[PDB]
């Protein structure tokens, strides 16, 4: 449809929320699961609702295959006590300043504009190098860090079956070159460990246990791919909310401590990630509908956020909001480990924008760009005004 309506599913998930909640496509052959307790249930009950995508024997064994994200237990929580070692408030008190360095570099490369897009200058290589930092990936390797970073998350320029196969071939080898730098990178930490994720998971052991290298390869490249365009949505997507919503923009700006309160309701009403997957593992009955062993399931947290038994008045964004039980990261074992660092992140950039540009506001050059993906929530580009320069 249009670019307004790629940018609100909002009416079509009301539709199905107030209709049919729990509904078989038959085309896409997945169950679509829209009010908040079915995504709920199908979220928690991991029992039922399997995450376990790794890639038959026939396909191609890339580390990702078999990464936390595409297990079930008892794999996936002896997998999950390892990398959370890696992930405390501990480490989290060593990234702020470096977040907040990066995010003053990023800034002061487009001191020189008054108009910047949001998404290029700042929201998207944010996390890239970020991410890349606390690592361990020295900072001379970070171009080709964020060049593989940019082929893996890559649209087609074209739409002919040969370019889609070419994009495939490139994204195959950027995977598999990332790979082989993670496999030296972590040689190299073998025997010069440092103060990054990387050296933390060599030496992570829980009940005698401990990560091997390809594990640590594929958790590398899952952080990447898991952690980069989603910061960079959430981000977007705030100030996207606070320029549509100035009063909620003037109220932040005198209550600087509710930004993290509003990034939530970002997280709530603007969800980087609208749905999610999973596979029935047992027959299961939801909303009154029978869901059969093997059959698909998408659960729809971005609909899920607009039941308004657990968010009253959804359509309206409340910076405030309380309560907020959102399901933005997820929710029970495979509830995101980057949650803290997508918040911080959001939150170091956010503030600095908001200090040092209060009278931003739409670039008369502003257009709606949306992501285009029914799973992603985001903006490709978003032009804002500094008004700091006289027009
Ligand atoms: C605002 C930004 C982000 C959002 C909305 C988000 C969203 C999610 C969601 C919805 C899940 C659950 C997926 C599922 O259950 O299958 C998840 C899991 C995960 N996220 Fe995030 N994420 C964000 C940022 C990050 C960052 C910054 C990192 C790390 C750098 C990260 C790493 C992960 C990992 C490793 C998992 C898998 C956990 C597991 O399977 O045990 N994410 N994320
Ligand atoms: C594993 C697959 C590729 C890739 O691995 C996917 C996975 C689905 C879940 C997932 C979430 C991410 O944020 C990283 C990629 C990834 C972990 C996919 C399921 C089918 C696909 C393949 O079988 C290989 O093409
Ligand atoms: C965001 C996810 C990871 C990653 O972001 C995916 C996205 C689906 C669309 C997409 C296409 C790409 O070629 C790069 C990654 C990516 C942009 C996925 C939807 C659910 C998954 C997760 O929720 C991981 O936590
Ligand atoms: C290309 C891969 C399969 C697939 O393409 C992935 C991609 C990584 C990012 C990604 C997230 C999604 O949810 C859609 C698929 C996809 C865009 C993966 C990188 C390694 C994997 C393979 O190399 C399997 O052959
Ligand atoms: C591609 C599917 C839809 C969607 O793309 C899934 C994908 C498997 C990998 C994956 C993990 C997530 O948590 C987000 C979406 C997603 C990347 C699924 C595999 C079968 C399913 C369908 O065939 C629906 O049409």
Redo the contacts with the bound molecule.
């Keep these: 449809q249009t670019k307004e309506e790629r940018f609100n599913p909002f009416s079509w998930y009301e539709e199905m929320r107030n209709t049919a909640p729990v509904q078989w496509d038959e085309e896409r052959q997945v169950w679509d699961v829209f009010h908040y307790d079915g995504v709920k249930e199908v979220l928690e009950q991991k029992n039922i609702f399997s995450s376990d995508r790794r890639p038959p024997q026939n396909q191609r064994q890339t580390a990702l295959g078999t990464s936390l994200?595409n297990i079930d237990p008892p794999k996936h929580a002896e997998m999950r006590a390892l990398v959370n070692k890696a992930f405390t408030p501990k480490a989290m008190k060593a990234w702020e300043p470096k977040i907040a360095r990066i995010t003053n570099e990023l800034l002061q490369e487009v001191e020189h504009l008054e108009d910047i897009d949001i998404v290029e200058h700042l929201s998207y290589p944010l996390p890239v190098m970020v991410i890349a930092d606390i690592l361990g990936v020295p900072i001379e390797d970070q171009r080709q860090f964020k060049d593989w970073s940019d082929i893996?998350?890559?649209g087609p320029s074209n739409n002919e079956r040969e370019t889609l196969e070419k994009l495939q071939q490139e994204?195959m080898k950027a995977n598999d070159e990332l790979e082989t730098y993670f496999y030296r990178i972590i040689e190299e930490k073998r025997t010069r460990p440092g103060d990054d994720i990387i050296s933390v998971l060599l030496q992570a052991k829980e009940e005698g246990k401990q990560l091997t290298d390809e594990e640590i390869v594929g958790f590398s490249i899952l952080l990447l791919?898991?952690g980069?365009?989603?910061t960079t949505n959430l981000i977007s997507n705030t100030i996207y909310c606070l320029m549509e919503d100035k009063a909620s923009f003037e109220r932040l700006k005198r209550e600087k401590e509710l930004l993290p309160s509003g990034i939530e309701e970002v997280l709530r009403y603007r969800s980087?990630?609208q749905?999610?997957?999973r596979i029935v593992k047992e027959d299961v009955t939801l909303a009154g509908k029978k869901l059969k062993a093997g059959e698909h399931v998408v659960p729809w947290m971005g609909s899920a956020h607009r039941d308004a038994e657990y968010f009253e008045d959804p359509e309206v964004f409340k910076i405030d909001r309380k309560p907020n039980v959102h399901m933005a990261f997820?929710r029970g074992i495979h509830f995101?480990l980057g949650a803290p660092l997508a918040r911080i992140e959001a939150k170091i950039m956010l503030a600095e924008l908001i200090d040092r540009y209060p009278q931003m506001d739409w670039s008369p050059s502003f257009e709606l760009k949306p992501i285009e993906?029914t799973?992603?929530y985001g903006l490709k580009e978003l032009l804002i005004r500094k008004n700091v320069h006289h027009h």
């Design positions: 994200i893996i998350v890559a994204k791919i898991a980069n365009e989603t980087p990630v749905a999610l997957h997820g995101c993906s799973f992603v």
